[PDB]
Design a binder for this molecule. Structure first.
Ligand SMILES: N[C@H](CCC(=O)N[C@@H](CS)C(=O)NCC(=O)O)C(=O)O
Ligand SMILES: N[C@H](CCC(=O)N[C@@H](CS)C(=O)NCC(=O)O)C(=O)O
Ligand SMILES: N[C@H](CCC(=O)N[C@@H](CS)C(=O)NCC(=O)O)C(=O)O
Ligand SMILES: N[C@H](CCC(=O)N[C@@H](CS)C(=O)NCC(=O)O)C(=O)O
Ligand code: FES
Ligand code: FES
Ligand code: NA
Ligand code: NA
Lengths: 113, 112, 113, 112
């Protein structure tokens, strides 16, 4: 344990669809992060992001915690899906759309109206 | 205009590194490696963090005819990216170019 | 000029569809090269490759000649198309298929039969 | 079997680097950087070129629970990849671990 592992654990436990990336969804800082965020966002459900370029503690500690050396990282329902290559392949096959749709449905409570 | 800004930058800084993040705080390992080799050459240099200058990030690639960052520019010419810079350092070429550039730019006429 | 630039120029002038990559099409040595070769090959036309991991002179000199720091590189009819990201996007849009089909047609002479 | 081979490797080599290419001739800059930091620590080490061992390339990721190369293994444990190794070197931690490992492995009982 470190306080930063504790922080990451909260983020992952509290956000069922979570993308750690370089930059933000509106202004990505790396093509790998841009590609991943485009495919994720196209699934049409709410997602949370962390810009690891503004969070040096997470940038340093997450790779070892995740057993995954790189960014971006998509975590869905507490599990690491993978990085850019994985996320875009899944989108290409239609599988990302299904995972994300079912995840948002599992955690849906209040509805706009 | 963004191109004019870029043109001046290249014109006014004899050793100039476009990179992601800053030398103390790189945002990409390619930019980290390039700045570390350059810094090792012992001469002052200028950098532009292209993540804080979205216009430059967007326009420099086509201006430079070089698609990526970092980019090292010396005496108004593109030297290359991370892989070029680190090989030059290994071969001792970068040290030479950087020494030569800094000394040529500091050189003055005798006083009188 | 160097003798290696001369060699690269011949390769590009003599091979209308040419992929410089890490490893070979049957045994790629890097996911970027694997992805590019898969998309290219799926276009269904003859292509030539150079494994730059067996050609240190080309690995050293091509990036500066190409104005393109990385591998893989797809060259079509003497022009650099780009690397992995470009080639797969083009395949995704159907544009790679058309470029490659028209290129093979332009250079076709003898036919099997 | 490929896993048994891997298990022995890790068991029999206290400082072990799985990489692309060899230390004199890396096939990837990530592998080049890791070997250069490791070599700088002053101790002998072993490497496996995973581009000449397709079975290891394929199987080690799931065995290691670490998807990529290079991978540095020390005293039977995974230290990490390129980014971990180069940061450890910068902080002086890698030097310590590598010195400690080599000395512990060379240590002998008094003669008698
Ligand atoms: N193959 C990609 C590559 C991702 C990647 O290479 N990320 C690098 C460059 S942005 C990285 O996160 N390095 C660690 C760091 O900069 O902290 C993927 O599937 O996600
Ligand atoms: N092969 C390296 C790597 C540099 C690189 O691949 N940069 C990429 C990723 S940081 C890039 O700038 N892409 C354009 C962009 O992100 O704006 C070199 O020699 O410079
Ligand atoms: N974004 C990719 C990246 C290609 C890439 O990063 N290639 C690197 C790693 S294989 C490279 O060729 N480095 C120069 C070298 O190893 O000689 C593309 O579109 O092609
Ligand atoms: N972020 C680096 C880079 C290492 C890396 O991204 N390796 C990739 C490209 S060489 C890889 O081994 N992919 C699996 C494979 O090619 O077998 C690290 O910390 O180790
Ligand atoms: S910021 Fe340079 S490769 Fe991602
Ligand atoms: S061989 Fe390592 S990124 Fe291509
Ligand atoms: Na981007
Ligand atoms: Na591959």
């Amino acid at each position: 344990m470190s306080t930063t592992i504790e922080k990451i654990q909260r983020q992952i436990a509290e956000n069922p669809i979570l993308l750690y990336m370089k930059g933000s969804p509106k202004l990505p800082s790396c093509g790998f992060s841009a590609q991943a965020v485009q495919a994720l966002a196209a699934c049409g459900e709410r997602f949370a992001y962390v810009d690891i370029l503004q969070n040096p503690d997470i940038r340093a500690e997450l790779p070892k915690y995740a057993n995954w050396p790189t960014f971006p990282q998509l975590w869905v329902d507490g599990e690491l899906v993978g990085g850019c290559d994985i996320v875009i392949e899944m989108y290409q096959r239609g599988e990302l759309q299904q995972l994300i749709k079912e995840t948002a449905a599992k955690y849906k409570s209040e509805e706009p109206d």
